[PDB]
Amino acid sequence: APPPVYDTEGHELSADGSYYVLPASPGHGGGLTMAPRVLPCPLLVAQETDERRKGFPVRFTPWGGAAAPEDRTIRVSTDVRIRFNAATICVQSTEWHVGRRVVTGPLGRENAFRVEKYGGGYKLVSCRDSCQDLGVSRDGARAWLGASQPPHVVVFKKA
């Protein structure tokens, strides 16, 4: 199998754990959060502009869910679903999907992502059809995660 994804303490990522998604280096902003874009729902995936803010941790789920193989180690280059492990003001799914921007809430493969080793950490990729790197775009007061260059390089700090 492809290698496991590792957290900032060097342990393999697990489908059981929750992980803050932080930049791999200082001076690149804070962690990922969910925030409304003009409408209060659905929430979209934003990056905190403030470096001190870790945002909300995420949970990874191997593609297939309960029907995926029993080895639920999270690995690179492998379809996974991603959600925020957090209560939401929208009473909707916190699972990520792409239709540009990464959105949560109700909707093939719109919710398929992968993690790839990249630079000093990992990049996240949307793989609805072909794999597209996810990057951050400042948009007024907010910075949004979407399909864009350059990729946003991240590490996973276990909560």
CSV table of C-alpha atoms in Angstrom, one decimal:
chain,number,residue,atom,x,y,z
A,1,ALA,CA,0.0,0.0,0.0
A,2,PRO,CA,1.1,3.6,-0.4
A,3,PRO,CA,2.7,5.1,2.7
A,4,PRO,CA,0.6,6.3,5.7
A,5,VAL,CA,0.0,10.0,6.3
A,6,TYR,CA,1.9,11.0,9.5
A,7,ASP,CA,0.9,13.6,12.1
A,8,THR,CA,3.2,16.3,13.6
A,9,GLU,CA,4.3,13.7,16.3
A,10,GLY,CA,5.2,11.2,13.7
A,11,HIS,CA,2.3,8.8,14.3
A,12,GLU,CA,0.2,7.4,11.5
A,13,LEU,CA,-3.1,9.2,10.9
A,14,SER,CA,-6.1,7.2,11.9
A,15,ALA,CA,-9.7,7.4,10.9
A,16,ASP,CA,-10.3,7.4,14.7
A,17,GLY,CA,-8.3,10.6,15.4
A,18,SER,CA,-9.1,14.3,14.8
A,19,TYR,CA,-6.4,16.6,13.4
A,20,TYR,CA,-5.9,20.3,13.1
A,21,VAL,CA,-4.8,21.2,9.6
A,22,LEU,CA,-2.0,23.7,10.0
A,23,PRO,CA,0.5,25.3,7.7
A,24,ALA,CA,3.8,23.4,7.5
A,25,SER,CA,5.8,26.6,8.2
A,26,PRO,CA,5.3,29.9,10.1
A,27,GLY,CA,4.0,33.0,8.3
A,28,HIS,CA,1.4,31.2,6.3
A,29,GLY,CA,-1.7,31.9,8.4
A,30,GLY,CA,-3.6,29.6,10.7
A,31,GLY,CA,-5.6,26.4,10.7
A,32,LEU,CA,-8.8,25.5,8.7
A,33,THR,CA,-12.2,26.4,9.8
A,34,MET,CA,-15.9,26.6,8.5
A,35,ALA,CA,-17.4,30.0,7.8
A,36,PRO,CA,-20.4,31.4,5.9
A,37,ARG,CA,-19.8,33.1,2.5
A,38,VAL,CA,-22.7,35.4,2.0
A,39,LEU,CA,-25.5,33.2,3.0
A,40,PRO,CA,-25.2,31.9,6.5
A,41,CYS,CA,-25.5,28.3,5.2
A,42,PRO,CA,-23.8,26.2,3.9
A,43,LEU,CA,-20.5,26.8,5.6
A,44,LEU,CA,-17.4,26.8,3.4
A,45,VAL,CA,-13.9,25.7,4.3
A,46,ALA,CA,-11.8,28.8,5.2
A,47,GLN,CA,-8.3,29.2,6.4
A,48,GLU,CA,-7.9,31.3,9.6
A,49,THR,CA,-6.0,34.5,8.7
A,50,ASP,CA,-4.6,34.6,12.2
A,51,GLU,CA,-1.6,32.2,12.7
A,52,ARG,CA,-2.5,31.7,16.4
A,53,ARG,CA,-5.9,30.2,15.5
A,54,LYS,CA,-5.8,26.4,14.9
A,55,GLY,CA,-9.4,26.3,13.6
A,56,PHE,CA,-11.4,23.1,13.8
A,57,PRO,CA,-9.9,19.6,13.6
A,58,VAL,CA,-10.9,17.2,10.8
A,59,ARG,CA,-11.6,13.5,10.7
A,60,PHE,CA,-10.6,11.4,7.7
A,61,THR,CA,-12.7,8.4,6.6
A,62,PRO,CA,-11.3,5.9,4.0
A,63,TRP,CA,-13.5,5.8,0.9
A,64,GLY,CA,-16.2,3.2,1.3
A,65,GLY,CA,-17.0,4.0,4.9
A,66,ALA,CA,-17.9,1.1,7.1
A,67,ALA,CA,-17.5,-1.1,4.0
A,68,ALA,CA,-13.9,0.0,3.5
A,69,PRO,CA,-11.2,-2.5,4.5
A,70,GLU,CA,-10.6,-3.0,8.3
A,71,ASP,CA,-7.1,-1.2,8.1
A,72,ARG,CA,-8.4,2.3,8.5
A,73,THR,CA,-4.8,3.9,8.5
A,74,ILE,CA,-5.0,7.0,6.4
A,75,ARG,CA,-2.6,6.7,3.5
A,76,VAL,CA,-1.3,9.1,0.8
A,77,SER,CA,-2.7,9.0,-2.8
A,78,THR,CA,-5.9,7.2,-1.6
A,79,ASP,CA,-9.5,8.4,-1.8
A,80,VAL,CA,-10.8,9.7,1.5
A,81,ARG,CA,-13.7,11.7,2.8
A,82,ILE,CA,-12.9,14.6,5.1
A,83,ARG,CA,-15.2,16.3,7.7
A,84,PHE,CA,-14.9,18.8,10.5
A,85,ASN,CA,-15.1,17.2,14.0
A,86,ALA,CA,-17.2,20.0,15.4
A,87,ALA,CA,-20.8,21.0,16.1
A,88,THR,CA,-22.2,23.2,13.4
A,89,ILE,CA,-24.5,26.2,13.4
A,90,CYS,CA,-26.1,25.1,10.2
A,91,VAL,CA,-27.5,21.7,11.3
A,92,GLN,CA,-26.0,20.2,8.1
A,93,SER,CA,-23.2,17.7,7.3
A,94,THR,CA,-19.7,19.0,8.1
A,95,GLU,CA,-18.3,16.8,5.3
A,96,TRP,CA,-16.3,18.6,2.6
A,97,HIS,CA,-17.2,18.5,-1.1
A,98,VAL,CA,-16.5,20.4,-4.3
A,99,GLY,CA,-19.2,21.2,-6.9
A,100,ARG,CA,-13.7,26.1,-7.0
A,101,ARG,CA,-14.4,26.4,-3.3
A,102,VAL,CA,-14.7,23.6,-0.8
A,103,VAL,CA,-18.1,23.5,0.8
A,104,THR,CA,-19.9,21.6,3.5
A,105,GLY,CA,-23.6,20.5,3.8
A,106,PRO,CA,-25.8,18.5,1.4
A,107,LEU,CA,-24.7,17.7,-2.2
A,108,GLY,CA,-20.4,11.4,-8.2
A,109,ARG,CA,-17.2,11.7,-6.2
A,110,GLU,CA,-17.9,15.4,-5.1
A,111,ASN,CA,-16.6,14.4,-1.6
A,112,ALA,CA,-13.5,12.5,-2.7
A,113,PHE,CA,-10.1,13.9,-1.6
A,114,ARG,CA,-6.6,12.6,-1.3
A,115,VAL,CA,-3.6,13.7,0.7
A,116,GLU,CA,-0.2,13.8,-1.1
A,117,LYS,CA,3.3,14.3,0.4
A,118,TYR,CA,4.4,17.7,-0.8
A,119,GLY,CA,7.1,20.2,0.2
A,120,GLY,CA,7.6,20.3,4.0
A,121,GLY,CA,4.3,18.5,4.6
A,122,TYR,CA,1.3,17.4,2.6
A,123,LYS,CA,-1.1,19.0,0.1
A,124,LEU,CA,-4.8,18.2,0.0
A,125,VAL,CA,-6.3,17.4,-3.3
A,126,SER,CA,-9.9,17.3,-4.7
A,127,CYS,CA,-10.3,14.2,-6.9
A,128,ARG,CA,-13.9,14.5,-8.2
A,129,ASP,CA,-12.6,13.7,-11.7
A,130,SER,CA,-8.9,14.4,-12.1
A,131,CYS,CA,-6.9,15.4,-9.0
A,132,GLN,CA,-6.8,19.1,-8.4
A,133,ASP,CA,-4.6,20.7,-5.7
A,134,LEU,CA,-6.3,22.7,-3.0
A,135,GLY,CA,-4.9,26.2,-2.3
A,136,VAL,CA,-6.1,29.3,-0.4
A,137,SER,CA,-7.4,32.5,-1.9
A,138,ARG,CA,-7.9,35.7,0.1
A,139,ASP,CA,-11.4,37.1,-0.7
A,140,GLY,CA,-11.9,40.3,1.3
A,141,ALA,CA,-12.1,39.5,5.0
A,142,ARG,CA,-11.8,35.8,4.5
A,143,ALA,CA,-9.4,33.2,2.9
A,144,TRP,CA,-11.1,30.3,1.2
A,145,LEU,CA,-9.9,26.8,0.4
A,146,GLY,CA,-10.5,25.9,-3.2
A,147,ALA,CA,-9.0,24.3,-6.4
A,148,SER,CA,-6.0,26.6,-7.0
A,149,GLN,CA,-2.3,27.2,-7.4
A,150,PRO,CA,-0.1,27.1,-5.5
A,151,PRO,CA,-1.2,24.2,-3.1
A,152,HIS,CA,-1.6,25.1,0.5
A,153,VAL,CA,1.1,23.0,2.3
A,154,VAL,CA,-0.1,21.5,5.6
A,155,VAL,CA,0.7,19.2,8.6
A,156,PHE,CA,-1.8,17.4,10.8
A,157,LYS,CA,-1.6,18.1,14.6
A,158,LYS,CA,-3.6,15.5,16.5
A,159,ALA,CA,-6.2,17.0,18.8
